[PDB]
Amino acid sequence: QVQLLESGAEVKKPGSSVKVSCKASGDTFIRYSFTWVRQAPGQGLEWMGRIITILDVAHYAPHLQGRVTITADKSTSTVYLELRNLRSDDTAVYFCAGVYEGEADEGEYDNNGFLKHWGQGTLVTVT
Amino acid sequence: NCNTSVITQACPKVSFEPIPIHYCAPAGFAILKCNSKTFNGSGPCTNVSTVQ
Amino acid sequence: ELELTQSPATLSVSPGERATLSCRASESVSSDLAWYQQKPGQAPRLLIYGASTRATGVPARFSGSGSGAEFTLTISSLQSEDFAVYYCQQYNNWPPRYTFGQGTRLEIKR
Ligand SMILES: *[C@@H]1O[C@H](CO)[C@@H](O[C@@H]2O[C@H](CO)[C@@H](O)[C@H](O)[C@H]2NC(C)=O)[C@H](O)[C@H]1NC(C)=O
Ligand SMILES: *[C@@H]1O[C@H](CO)[C@@H](O[C@@H]2O[C@H](CO)[C@@H](O)[C@H](O)[C@H]2NC(C)=O)[C@H](O)[C@H]1NC(C)=O
């Protein structure tokens, strides 16, 4: 029931920063959690982090946290990813995913570690 | 400006069942107890005893 | 941290074959492992979670099991439709330092 609508593609000079986002639709944003992944350009996937929307809490992969911020603005049902101090090594397709949680609104949150709803993928490269 | 402080901790489950705990006064102190069966939340007791 | 290894990089298959895609973990997990289908240009669709439970929308062809650090995804009566790169994901982590395998491609030989 959850749709994820990714933001468009972008190109940034190394050392700079990029911010991308996903709009959630068809469900209640605060009801369930979202995660971000980085799909390397012809290589496998890297988990980047997780954001809990019921609690404004996020966790990050151990080699990314000095560069990555994951946030959200529930008033627009939007999940955001911000990366700073970019390198060509970060060229990848970035995207959101979500998992329905057991009524987080009622405090019955499951904290599911697997993802079901996936976005399209937004390519971010450098220049 | 208030900023919520968030701590992530391990989440083990444990057996959890309350055990009776008694409190005891240290040397130099004593605990008085009200023995009325009709005792109020406050006020005098005429049946008073001392316990450690 | 955790690492996952797919045994085949590419599995040698043919239509109607039983795919057997194993995954080895660097450390043990109990049920907190999931499988995904990465098709070219597509989202990595969820197939299996909880080691053996299939997600709604997943064909009955897909099933699997495992424990400890040894898990396998199998596909009964494999279709050309199933030729996705399969990824193994492990999430029994708190803080949630979740990981992925390198991905196994299926290929029809000829
Ligand atoms: C004050 O309360 C105590 C506690 O109930 C009364 O003494 C008890 O009387 C029963 C009767 O069988 C005994 O079994 C208990 O062992 C007694 N307890 C103690 C500590 O002696 C006591 O008589 C009451 N005193 C007054 C003045 O009412
Ligand atoms: C329960 O608490 C009330 C409130 O203090 C007690 O009422 C007082 O009792 C004393 C006894 O002489 C009176 O002088 C006060 O004027 C009372 N206060 C009020 C507001 O009336 C009451 O006696 C307590 N009950 C018991 C059993 O001790």
Domain ranges, ordered by start, for chain C: 1-110
Burial class for B43, CB neighbours closer than 10 Å (0-12, 13-18, 19+): exposed
* Method by which this entry was solved: cryo-EM
E strands present in chain C: 4-6, 10-13, 19-25, 33-38, 44-49, 53-54, 62-67, 70-75, 85-90, 99-100, 104-108
CB A58 within 8 A of CB A80: no
Quick one: how many helices (H) and strands (E) in chain B?
0, 2
From chain B, which residues contact A within 8 Å (Cβ)?
4, 6, 8
Q: Give the integer Cα–Cα distance in Å for B40 and A23.
A: 61
Which amino acid would we find at residue C21?
L
CB A33 within 8 A of CB A53: yes
C95 at interface of B, judged by CB pairs closer than 8 A? yes
Q: Whose CA is nearest to atom 28 of ligand 1?
A: B47
Number of domains in chain A: 1
DSSP reduced 3-state for B44:
coil
Residues 6 or more apart in contact with residue C26 via CB below 8 angstroms:
C2, C3, C4, C5, C69
The candidate with the shortest Cα–Cα distance to C23, out of C39, C35, C12, C13, is C35
CA distance B10 to chain C (A): 6
Task: Output the CA B51–ligand 1 centroid distance in Å.
Answer: 13
Backbone dihedral angles phi then psi of residue A106, each to the nearest 5 degrees:
-100, 0
- Kindly report the CA angle at A53 between A48 and A55, in degrees rounded to 5? 105
Boundaries of domain holding A122: 1-127
CB C82 within 8 A of CB C61: yes
Q: Which atom of ligand 2 lies at the shortest distance from residue B43's CA?
A: 28
Backbone dihedral angles phi then psi of residue A89, each to the nearest 5 degrees:
-65, -20
Task: Output the CA B47–ligand 1 centroid distance in Å.
Answer: 9
**What residue ranges line ligand 1, CB within 6 angstroms?**
B 35, 47, 49
